[PDB]
């Protein structure tokens, strides 16, 4: 019944992409290492699904990537089928028993497209396009529907939000966020979508907003302890964790935790690898 | 360089 945090890859203090994989357990507050990924990837995404960690896309310093590798967490990494497109700073989520990845950047273009991974046939299928091309936007599932949030189209940091209805296969617009953010963290918690930090085009942000789904409205939440952009976000037993990132001067090694009980953020660790644009996901143990 | 990133 006990979940843990996972952090893969990203951009490290030696200002290169890394291959470090870390586990963080919030109950003991201990860190540990898992086996490294095969290649070093910054700008990278990660999801877990049925006790399998997938590492998706990213950028190694020479090329952006379509490759994807896998680890049965119950440890050696192995390659599975590649995406149709090379994607860094892509959004990524799971729904049903599928992976969905959307947006990103191949080295020339930002993508509107979303593709989907089926572990039963080891194949990535392309789906319908978003209206806006987005890098640095997160994907989050709520009640069987996918939301893409904020990001960057090549010219503008975005406050726009789109939702994908699997019953229709179409994207539609939702009410936008109050502030434009790229590199923000996004997670679902108690039927609200939280967006934490990111970069609005001038300032690195500590600000947090929450989308009430039942009302189609956004509200300001308590700012984090420190600005963070290109930051991971995940929910673990009813609490929202902000993970590493860039504060606009330095790479963060700390995770902070938002407890709705106190409506407040607490640093729970100062000890991970400093890094940003890494992938994060939750593991059942 | 994505917006708001560190120097490289
Ligand atoms: Na509030």
Residue numbers in the entry:
A (entry chain A): 279 to 352, 357 to 567
B (entry chain E): 656 to 663
Question: What does the paper behind this entry write?
Answer:
KLHL12 belongs to the BTB-BACK-Kelch family of proteins, which includes E3s such as KEAP1 (KLHL19) and gigaxonin (KLHL16). Interaction with Cullin3 is mediated by the BTB domain and a ‘3-box' motif from the BACK domain, whereas the Kelch domain mediates substrate capture. In the current work, we address this gap in understanding, by defining a consensus recognition motif ‘PGXPP' common to both substrates and co-adaptors of KLHL12.
